[PDB]
Amino acid sequence: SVSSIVSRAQFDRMLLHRNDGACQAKGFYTYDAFVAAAAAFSGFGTTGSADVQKREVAAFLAQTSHETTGGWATAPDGAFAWGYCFKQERGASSDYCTPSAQWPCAPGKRYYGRGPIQLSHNYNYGPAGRAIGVDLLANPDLVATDATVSFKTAMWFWMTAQPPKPSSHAVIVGQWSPSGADRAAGRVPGFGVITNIINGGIECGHGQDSRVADRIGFYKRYCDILGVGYGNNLDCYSQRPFA
């Protein structure tokens, strides 16, 4: 049902310039691929009222747009029209291998960021590949070469709790309730705690941050396009990182 809520026209209006300029992933991120991936993750964009469903797709596309953004302050149509410009991390310093019995690194393979959520590390490629049905420890580049696997890895990340963190899905559909430690930390439901889930260690809890604002910039633009309210608690400037 996610295609009922977001049309191809809408999708393209939000992801306006992905196939433009000097973007590195032109033609790669397709509506059809997005919609097929969404189907594998039951509940995504189909949980709650029509308004909750829109917020979820907006929030999803907004977090992933930041991770892949080719935007700048004076970019054509604004900085928030240039998400999904990249599919691979540019100039990683390492293979992102952190030695693991559970998720062992494959020799000569690298787990730098790929796809919509710029998935990183063996200990994320491992689980994600298990969920999707395919070996991403041995072939992590699949995340950069198959448009449907790419989206599937981002939605796996969206739909999956990694304690003490809840899933981004649970938060945006209003299913998450903060613990006592969460409330001590100032973590309250909303878009801002999803930013905390994604990259809170660097971005959250220390006042106004340009990266956090960029995520919110995409979110508001997409919410506007889908015609839905933003909901509360958009930033994480006053939230301690998870731990």
From Swiss-Prot:
Report the protein's function: Defense against chitin-containing fungal pathogens.
Per the Swiss-Prot or TrEMBL record, the active site comprises 67
Single GO MF annotation: endochitinase activity
Name the Enzyme Commission number(s) assigned to this protein.
3.2.1.14
InterPro entries named in the record: Glyco_hydro_19, Glyco_hydro_19_cat, Lysozyme-like_dom_sf
Disulfide bond positions: 23-85, 97-105, 204-236
Q: Which reaction does it catalyse?
A: Random endo-hydrolysis of N-acetyl-beta-D-glucosaminide (1->4)-beta-linkages in chitin and chitodextrins
Which terms under GO biological process does the entry name? cell wall macromolecule catabolic process; chitin catabolic process; defense response to fungus; polysaccharide catabolic process
CDD domains per the UniProt record, alphabetical: chitinase_GH19
- Recorded protein name is 26 kDa endochitinase 2
Q: Which UniProt keywords apply?
A: Carbohydrate metabolism, Chitin degradation, Disulfide bond, Glycosidase, Hydrolase, Plant defense, Polysaccharide degradation, Signal
Query: What family is this protein classified in?
Result: Belongs to the glycosyl hydrolase 19 family. Chitinase class II subfamily.
Q: PANTHER family, from UniProt?
A: CHITINASE, CHITINASE-RELATED
Q: Name one Pfam family in it.
A: Glyco_hydro_19
Report which superkingdom the organism of origin falls in. Answer: Eukaryota
In which organism is this protein found? Hordeum vulgare (Barley)
